[PDB]
């Protein structure tokens, strides 16, 4: 059966085995927008994704399930090519399951996490500053089809852009400067 059918079973607990890794084509394909109303499966998927982030952040649960801590997850990482992402940033400073998220405005200023970025789908390290917009205005729909328009900055902005990149088939290392990975370009804010 399809990944979505499998993952949305009531009994299913997403774990690292459901997360596809580099090389799997799905991570480089642009995800299909979801239509409204959402199917029960699409709603359940978003919930399963958020439960996974919560489990990955619980020391006891993370150890038992063999999970890597994460603050974001995109459906393509589960081999589901739908524009659905989940973000969970503990202070939670940000908690959202977003359907068809889209950046509708961004700052001229860029930003990058000082400590760089990792990815549950990447088993290895690619050091460097992952250059992103410092600030973004994001439109997304929640499970009931209601539209939300939020403004993000700092770490939250980074996390959300990172997940939106997945639904567009972009990986974090694609935004690190090949030549000099730690170059601090003009207008780049290091967090």
Kindly list the residues in this chain that would bind Fe ion in the complex (CB under 5 A). Answer: 119
State the nearest-atom distance from the C-beta of 145 to Fe ion, in Å: 26
What DSSP state is assigned to residue 90? Answer: -
Closest CA to 164 of 94, 83, 104: 83
Q: Which residue is nearest to Fe ion (CB)?
A: 119
163 noted as active-site residue: yes
Kind of pairing between the strands at 147-152 and 136-141: antiparallel
Nearer to Fe ion, 138 or 149 (CB): 138
Q: Is the bond preceding 51 in cis, omega lying within 30 degrees of 0?
A: no
Nearer to Fe ion, 90 or 145 (CB): 90
Closest CA to 107 of 188, 48, 28, 178: 188
162 is in an annotated binding site: yes
Nearer to Fe ion, 74 or 149 (CB): 74
119 is in an annotated binding site: yes
Distance CA 173, CA 125 (A): 9
State the nearest-atom distance from the C-beta of 165 to Fe ion, in Å: 8
State the nearest-atom distance from the C-beta of 120 to Fe ion, in Å: 6
The active-site residue out of 5, 63, 117, 163 is 163
Known catalytic residues are 163
């Amino acid at each position: 059966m399809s990944a979505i059918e499998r993952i949305t079973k009531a009994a299913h607990l997403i774990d690292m085995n459901d997360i596809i890794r580099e090389g799997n084509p799905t991570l480089r394909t642009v995800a299909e927008e979801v239509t409204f109303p959402l199917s029960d499966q699409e709603i359940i998927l978003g919930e399963k994704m958020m439960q996974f982030l919560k489990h990955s952040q619980d020391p006891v649960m993370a150890e038992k399930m063999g999970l890597r801590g994460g603050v974001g997850l995109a459906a393509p990482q589960l081999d589901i090519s739908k524009r659905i992402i989940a973000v969970l940033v503990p202070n939670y400073d940000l908690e959202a399951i977003m359907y068809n998220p889209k950046i509708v405005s961004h700052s001229v200023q860029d930003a990058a996490l000082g400590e760089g970025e990792g990815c549950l789908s990447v088993d290895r390290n690619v050091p460097g500053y992952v250059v992103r917009h410092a600030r973004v205005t994001v439109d997304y729909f929640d499970k009931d089809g209601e539209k939300h328009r939020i403004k993000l900055k700092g770490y939250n902005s980074i996390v959300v852009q990172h997940e939106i990149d997945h639904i567009n088939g972009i990986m974090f290392y694609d935004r690190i400067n090949e030549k000099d990975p730690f170059a601090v370009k003009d207008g780049l804010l290091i967090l």
